[PDB]
Amino acid sequence: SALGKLQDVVNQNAQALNTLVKQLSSNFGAISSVLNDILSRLDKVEAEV
Amino acid sequence: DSFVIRGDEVRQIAPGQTGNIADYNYKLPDDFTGCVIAWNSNNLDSKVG
């Protein structure tokens, strides 16, 4: 429990990297989270948007 | 740029379009800066037989 200070500093950097990676899976209102999936389905001008 | 086309295919004369004329006859750029102007010409451009 004394080393809780150092373990918290390891955990925060791991949790920030996990959250940064997990945000690759989010749509942000787009049709899909995967670039090849968007590009495959759509007109280039719709796919760009 | 000037040509005669069937009324259905006039939709193909725009940036990012697809189909016979856009693919194989008259291709616009993806970043076209310009105007596309058209009118039905049946009284001049059709003929008996």
Tab-separated table of C-alpha atoms in Angstrom:
chain	number	residue	atom	x	y	z
A	1	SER	CA	0.000	0.000	0.000
A	2	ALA	CA	2.948	2.436	0.411
A	3	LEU	CA	3.800	1.912	-3.329
A	4	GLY	CA	0.212	2.898	-4.316
A	5	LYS	CA	1.790	6.202	-5.554
A	6	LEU	CA	4.038	4.424	-8.114
A	7	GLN	CA	1.397	1.833	-9.093
A	8	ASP	CA	-1.177	4.637	-9.752
A	9	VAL	CA	1.379	6.306	-12.125
A	10	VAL	CA	1.741	2.992	-14.051
A	11	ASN	CA	-2.045	2.409	-14.084
A	12	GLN	CA	-2.900	5.942	-15.384
A	13	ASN	CA	-0.556	5.606	-18.391
A	14	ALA	CA	-1.909	2.090	-19.159
A	15	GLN	CA	-5.561	3.292	-18.834
A	16	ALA	CA	-4.872	6.322	-21.083
A	17	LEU	CA	-3.301	4.084	-23.801
A	18	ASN	CA	-6.193	1.540	-23.511
A	19	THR	CA	-8.727	4.400	-23.926
A	20	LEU	CA	-6.765	5.910	-26.855
A	21	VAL	CA	-6.738	2.473	-28.612
A	22	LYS	CA	-10.426	1.656	-27.857
A	23	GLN	CA	-11.465	4.970	-29.504
A	24	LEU	CA	-10.361	3.513	-32.901
A	25	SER	CA	-13.567	1.364	-32.744
A	26	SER	CA	-15.991	4.359	-32.371
A	27	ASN	CA	-18.200	5.542	-35.291
A	28	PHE	CA	-18.445	9.322	-34.507
A	29	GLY	CA	-21.741	9.263	-36.515
A	30	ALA	CA	-20.080	7.617	-39.577
A	31	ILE	CA	-21.534	4.467	-41.260
A	32	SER	CA	-18.704	2.247	-39.864
A	33	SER	CA	-15.506	2.308	-37.738
A	34	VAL	CA	-13.332	0.589	-40.449
A	35	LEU	CA	-11.896	2.589	-43.398
A	36	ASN	CA	-11.956	-0.325	-45.917
A	37	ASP	CA	-15.620	-0.949	-44.952
A	38	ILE	CA	-16.627	2.710	-45.686
A	39	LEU	CA	-14.579	2.736	-48.934
A	40	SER	CA	-16.075	-0.589	-50.147
A	41	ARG	CA	-19.779	0.403	-49.737
A	42	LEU	CA	-19.920	3.994	-50.972
A	43	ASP	CA	-19.553	6.518	-53.784
A	44	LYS	CA	-16.091	8.176	-53.348
A	45	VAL	CA	-17.726	11.582	-52.561
A	46	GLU	CA	-19.981	10.030	-49.868
A	47	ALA	CA	-17.068	7.898	-48.552
A	48	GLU	CA	-14.916	11.078	-48.274
A	49	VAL	CA	-17.663	12.748	-46.153
B	1	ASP	CA	-17.065	20.722	-74.138
B	2	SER	CA	-20.051	19.785	-76.345
B	3	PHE	CA	-21.838	16.523	-77.270
B	4	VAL	CA	-25.264	14.795	-77.735
B	5	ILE	CA	-26.400	12.149	-75.171
B	6	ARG	CA	-29.638	10.296	-74.138
B	7	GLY	CA	-31.644	12.008	-71.332
B	8	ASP	CA	-31.108	9.130	-68.825
B	9	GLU	CA	-27.282	9.340	-69.101
B	10	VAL	CA	-27.115	13.162	-68.421
B	11	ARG	CA	-26.929	12.261	-64.664
B	12	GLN	CA	-23.470	10.749	-65.424
B	13	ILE	CA	-22.032	14.188	-66.443
B	14	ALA	CA	-20.919	15.252	-62.919
B	15	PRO	CA	-17.792	14.911	-60.658
B	16	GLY	CA	-17.439	11.417	-59.092
B	17	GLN	CA	-20.075	9.790	-61.430
B	18	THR	CA	-20.112	6.207	-62.873
B	19	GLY	CA	-21.765	4.387	-65.850
B	20	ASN	CA	-21.193	4.104	-69.639
B	21	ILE	CA	-20.547	7.774	-70.492
B	22	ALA	CA	-18.669	8.759	-67.299
B	23	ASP	CA	-16.587	5.538	-67.572
B	24	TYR	CA	-15.938	5.288	-71.347
B	25	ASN	CA	-16.831	8.576	-73.172
B	26	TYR	CA	-16.522	11.779	-71.036
B	27	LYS	CA	-14.879	11.703	-67.557
B	28	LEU	CA	-14.901	14.782	-65.297
B	29	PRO	CA	-12.178	15.309	-62.628
B	30	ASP	CA	-13.024	14.426	-58.992
B	31	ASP	CA	-12.368	18.140	-58.112
B	32	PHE	CA	-14.239	19.695	-61.088
B	33	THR	CA	-14.609	23.525	-61.032
B	34	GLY	CA	-17.152	24.412	-63.693
B	35	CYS	CA	-20.776	24.121	-64.858
B	36	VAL	CA	-22.727	21.324	-66.615
B	37	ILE	CA	-25.464	22.748	-68.838
B	38	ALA	CA	-27.988	20.599	-70.744
B	39	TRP	CA	-31.273	20.741	-72.664
B	40	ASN	CA	-33.553	18.295	-74.484
B	41	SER	CA	-32.915	18.736	-78.273
B	42	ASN	CA	-35.437	16.207	-79.732
B	43	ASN	CA	-36.742	18.632	-82.441
B	44	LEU	CA	-33.213	18.892	-84.045
B	45	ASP	CA	-31.334	15.720	-83.022
B	46	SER	CA	-33.990	13.065	-83.892
B	47	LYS	CA	-34.813	11.909	-87.492
B	48	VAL	CA	-37.435	9.748	-89.324
B	49	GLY	CA	-36.345	6.056	-89.291
